[PDB]
Amino acid sequence: ANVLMIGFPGEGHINPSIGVMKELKSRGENITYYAVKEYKEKITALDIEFREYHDFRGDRDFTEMLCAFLKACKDIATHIYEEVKHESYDYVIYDHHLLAGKVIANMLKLPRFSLCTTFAMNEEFAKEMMGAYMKGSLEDSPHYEEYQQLAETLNADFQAEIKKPFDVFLADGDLTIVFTSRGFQPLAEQFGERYVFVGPSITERHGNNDFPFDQIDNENVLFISMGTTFNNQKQFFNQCLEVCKDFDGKVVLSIGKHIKTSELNDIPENFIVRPYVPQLEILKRASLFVTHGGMNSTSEGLYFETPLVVIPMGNDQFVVADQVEKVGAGKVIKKEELSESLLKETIQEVMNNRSYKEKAKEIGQSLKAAGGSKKAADSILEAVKQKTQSANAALEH
Numbered sequence: 001a002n003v004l005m006i007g008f009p010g011e012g013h014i015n016p017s018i019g020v021m022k023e024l025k026s027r028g029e030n031i032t033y034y035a036v037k038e039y040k041e042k043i044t045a046l047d048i049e050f051r052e053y054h055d056f057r058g059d060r061d062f063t064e065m066l067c068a069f070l071k072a073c074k075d076i077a078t079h080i081y082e083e084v085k086h087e088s089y090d091y092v093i094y095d096h097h098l099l100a101g102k103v104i105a106n107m108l109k110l111p112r113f114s115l116c117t118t119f120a121m122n123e124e125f126a127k128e129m130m131g132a133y134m135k136g137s138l139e140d141s142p143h144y145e146e147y148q149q150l151a152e153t154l155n156a157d158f159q160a161e162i163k164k165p166f167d168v169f170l171a172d173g174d175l176t177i178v179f180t181s182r183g184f185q186p187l188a189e190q191f192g193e194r195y196v197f198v199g200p201s202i203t204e205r206h207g208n209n210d211f212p213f214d215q216i217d218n219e220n221v222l223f224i225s226m227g228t229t230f231n232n233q234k235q236f237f238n239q240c241l242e243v244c245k246d247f248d249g250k251v252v253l254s255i256g257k258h259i260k261t262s263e264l265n266d267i268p269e270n271f272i273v274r275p276y277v278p279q280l281e282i283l284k285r286a287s288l289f290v291t292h293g294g295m296n297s298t299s300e301g302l303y304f305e306t307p308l309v310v311i312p313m314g315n316d317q318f319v320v321a322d323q324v325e326k327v328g329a330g331k332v333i334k335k336e337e338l339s340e341s342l343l344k345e346t347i348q349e350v351m352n353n354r355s356y357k358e359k360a361k362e363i364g365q366s367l368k369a370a371g372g373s374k375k376a377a378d379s380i381l382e383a384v385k386q387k388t389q390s391a392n393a394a395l396e397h
């Protein structure tokens, strides 16, 4: 079948969608993936028709974020529809957090599926998990009346079916694939059968082979990454250089793309410091993961039964951090308590710790049991089959 896929601008969005595209393609499907230019190689790598839309990141108040996401919906929906209108697609997949995806699905009159790369969210989750506060009342919010104008226009002119603010950021398809298990998902019981909890979507990405695996293959490996988004971090990597310099093995520091490695302090002789690592392959070989608590890093780590130390900074990280504390699989350091000493003690406590390893194994196994990129494909293709046979029953007119 012909599949329109519309991604969201961020690596933690794109990465889990790779497994599902790769599973769908190896089953006969031709895919057209829309993303921002940054992540092209990640899609070209799969041998999948790549296409672009304006990166709206390069251009925290709740009502402003609603309006930015509606401006972008309108631009993406217009741009993408202009290009796809004459093409023959059988269904659309899109990032749960990209409303334009649901709008494209409505303009093509096709079956659609959302991929949720965070925990599943309903009205019982705080705005703060999507990285927004309100100072006081919604009325006195600066973009309040703008939100009411744009939502209204997108409903009338774009079939955006926005009944509620949260519908801007949580765009349910006919199904919502969620990349966690009901086990790990807080308030799992509040999500019906249209939420398919498939756990993490793990498969070889391309770019991996450059890293020297032979240096870490028969060694203890401490892996550290604060993600792909939380910079302001040169301070923290400097602290990692001092805390871990006498580690008895290899320390793999992924510092991200906005900090030159020469801008840090002296690298000890036992460190491999890169802007980007093949995280899946590093986790395969890692004893311990010091992570920011990003949904994907956290659930990639547990998938490899890696005990964690989680230093959460923003967005959903507090909620995922707390889920790691809850299931026994790791230990959280609050930013306010972060110090070289407490970083060193926390790593020494969790390294090789029988109790953290057991609990990491349990939740790791809950997450694998959810069926992964494979389950995402069975569930989607089966929904498509039923709606095709349903709609293909135009043998009355």
Ligand SMILES: O=c1ccn([C@@H]2O[C@H](COP(=O)(O)OP(=O)(O)O)[C@@H](O)[C@H]2O)c(=O)[nH]1
Binding pocket: 010, 011, 012, 013, 015, 016, 225, 226, 227, 228, 229, 230, 254, 255, 275, 276, 277, 278, 279, 280, 293, 294, 295, 296, 297, 298, 300
């Ligand atoms: O050096 C790195 C750093 C990050 N990642 C990937 O980037 C994504 C980060 O998503 P997460 O939800 O953990 O954090 P965010 O960066 O979105 O805060 C994950 O799939 C990681 O495997 C990677 O491959 N190599």
